[PDB]
Structure formats: structure tokens, C-alpha cells
Amino acid sequence: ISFQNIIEGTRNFHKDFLIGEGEIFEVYRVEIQNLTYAVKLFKCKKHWKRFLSELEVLLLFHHPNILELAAYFTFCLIYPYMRNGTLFDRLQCVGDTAPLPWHIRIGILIGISKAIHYLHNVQPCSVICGSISSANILLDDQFQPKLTDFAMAHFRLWYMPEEYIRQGKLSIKTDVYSFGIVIMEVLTGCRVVLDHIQLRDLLRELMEKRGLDSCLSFLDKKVPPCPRNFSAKLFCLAGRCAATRAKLRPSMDEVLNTLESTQASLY
Numbered sequence: 662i663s664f665q666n667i668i669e670g671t672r673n674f675h676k677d678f679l680i681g682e683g684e685i686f687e688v689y690r691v692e693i694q695n696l697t698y699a700v701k702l703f704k705c706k707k708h709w710k711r712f713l714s715e716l717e718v719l720l721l722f723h724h725p726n727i728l729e730l731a732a733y734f735t736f737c738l739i740y741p742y743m744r745n746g747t748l749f750d751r752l753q754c755v756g757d758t759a760p761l762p763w764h765i766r767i768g769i770l771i772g773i774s775k776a777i778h779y780l781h782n783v784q785p786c787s788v789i790c791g792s793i794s795s796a797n798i799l800l801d802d803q804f805q806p807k808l809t810d811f812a813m814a815h816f817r818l819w820y821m822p823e824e825y826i827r828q829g830k831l832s833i834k835t836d837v838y839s840f841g842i843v844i845m846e847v848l849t850g851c852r853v854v855l856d857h858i859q860l861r862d863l864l865r866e867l868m869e870k871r872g873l874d875s876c877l878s879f880l881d882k883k884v885p886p887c888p889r890n891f892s893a894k895l896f897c898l899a900g901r902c903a904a905t906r907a908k909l910r911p912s913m914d915e916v917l918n919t920l921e922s923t924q925a926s927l928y
């Protein structure tokens with residue numbers, strides 16, 4: 662609420678409160694009364710335009726699965742603290758946390774797809790998210806997912822498709838492509854790059870040569886296998902989302918409906 666609040670809430674930015682740091686922000690945990698926050702300390706015109714883009718999105722649009730801006734000062738942005746961390750960290754079991762069970766994994770994918778579906782259709786101009794990734798998906802105390810990072814958003818590089826890298830093109834289908842790779846991480850528990858090939862290339866090669874049921878062998882070993890058709894629907898959906906040709910990718914609306922029927926077969 663005040664900046665004085667952030668100094669006290671961090672014991673003046675003591676290291677005990679430092680969460681981490683990226684390219685644009687230094688990030689601290691802040692305790693203000695009986696709520697916990699993460700403050701992203703704005704640390705180059707490129708940097709600046711990405712700060713504005715983050716502010717623009719979060720001040721105008723709101724969704725249960727988008728991490729909301731609570732306050733800002735101007736230089737910093739304050740968000741509610743997400744105690745279960747990033748999807749990436751949980752898939753990689755950072756800190757020796759237990760692997761996520763399938764019903765949470767599919768719930769995470771559904772929530773994020775709703776957030777993207779909402780952003781792709783907000784009343785004035787639609788929003789292309791631009792930085793969809795397992796790192797930018799945060800998780801609350803019940804593993805409800807929260808989409809974050811709109812520094813690359815636009816109104817209409819492992820996660821980026823060819824037509825973006827090669828020709829600068831950007832669309833609704835950009836987010837679908839990135840989301841497809843996230844599904845691949847969620848199914849396998851692998852990083853986007855493997856110990857040195859890309860997860861997307863490995864799964865696409867396997868699906869073309871050996872069909873959808875052969876990916877069963879790449880399901881995350883740290884849980885018992887999900888049902889066969891759950892796996893096949895999700896690998897299929899991931900492969901289509903990550904297609905090289907944008908025209909082959911489903912809309913996020915169709916993705917959401919597919920994810921939701923996939924969840925039903927789990928129950």
C-alpha cells in the first residue's frame with residue numbers, strides 16, 4: 662500500500678527475503694500485515710517498454726488464472742505471493758517436492774488455457790501473451806494456476822515458433838505453440854531441452870513414426886501412468902499446438918474444450 666510498507670516488510674531488503682532476479686526485476690518476499698507479497702524491483706528503453714507492457718495488461722484485464730497486480734509505485738510492481746512456486750519448479754521437483762499427480766497437472770493446464778482464451782478475446786483489442794512457459798505459470802496454495810509475465814504482450818527462444826523467429830510474425834497461434842510445449846513438459850516432466858535436443862523435436866519425431874500410443878513410454882516416471890486415452894489425447898493436443906504451420910494449430914478455445922474432456926476421462 663505504501664513504499665514504507667515494503668522496506669519494513671523485507672527488513673529493508675535483507676537477503677532472508679530475496680526470492681530471485683531476472684532481466685528486468687529484483688524480486689523480494691514482502692510480509693505486509695497478514696498477507697505475503699512478491700515485489701519486483703524495476704532495475705535501457707527496451708526494459709522500460711516491457712515494464713509498461715506489463716502494467717498495461719494487468720491494470721486493464723483481470724481473470725482468476727492471471728496473477729493480479731495489487732499495487733505499483735512510480736519503481737516496482739507488487740503481486741500476491743504464490744507459495745507453490747512455478748510450474749517448472751514443481752515439474753522438476755525443486756526442493757524435493759513430491760511430483761504433481763495427474764489431476765493437478767490437468768487442472769493447471771485448464772486454468773492457464775482459460776486465462777489465455779480470455780486474453781485472446783478481451784473486448785477492445787485482443788492480447789497476445791508472448792511469454793507463455795512453465796516458468797511463467799505460478800501456483801497458489803491449492804495449485805490454482807496464475808499466468809504471469811506480459812512484458813512481451815501485444816494487441817491484435819525455445820517456446821517461440823519458426824514464423825516468429827524467422828519472419829517476426831506474431832498471432833493468437835503464437836501462444837498456442839508455446840502452450841503446446843508446456844503440455845509436453847507437463848506430460849513428460851522433461852525440460853524443453855534434454856541432456857542436446859529439444860523436447861518438441863523428440864516428441865514430434867516419435868509421434869510421426871510410432872503413433873500416439875508410443876509416447877506412453879515418455880510419461881513422467883515419477884507417477885504411475887495415467888489412463889491410456891488421457892495420455893493419447895494430451896500428446897495429440899500438444900503435437901497439434903506445437904505444429905510448425907500455424908494453420909495446423911488449434912485455437913485456444915478448442916484447446917480448452919479438449920483439455921476439459923481429457924480431465925473428465927480421468928474421473
Ligand SMILES: Nc1ncnc2c1ncn2[C@@H]1O[C@H](COP(=O)(O)OP(=O)(O)OP(O)(O)=S)[C@@H](O)[C@H]1O
Pocket residue numbers: 680681682683684685686687688699701728740741742743744746747799810812
Ligand atoms: N508472485 C510471485 N510469487 C512468488 N515468486 C515470484 C512471484 N513473482 C516472481 N517470483 C519469482 O521471483 C523470481 C524472479 O522473477 P523473474 O520472473 O525471473 O523476474 P523478471 O525480471 O520479471 O523476469 P524476466 O522474464 O527474466 S524479465 C523467480 O524465481 C519467480 O518465480
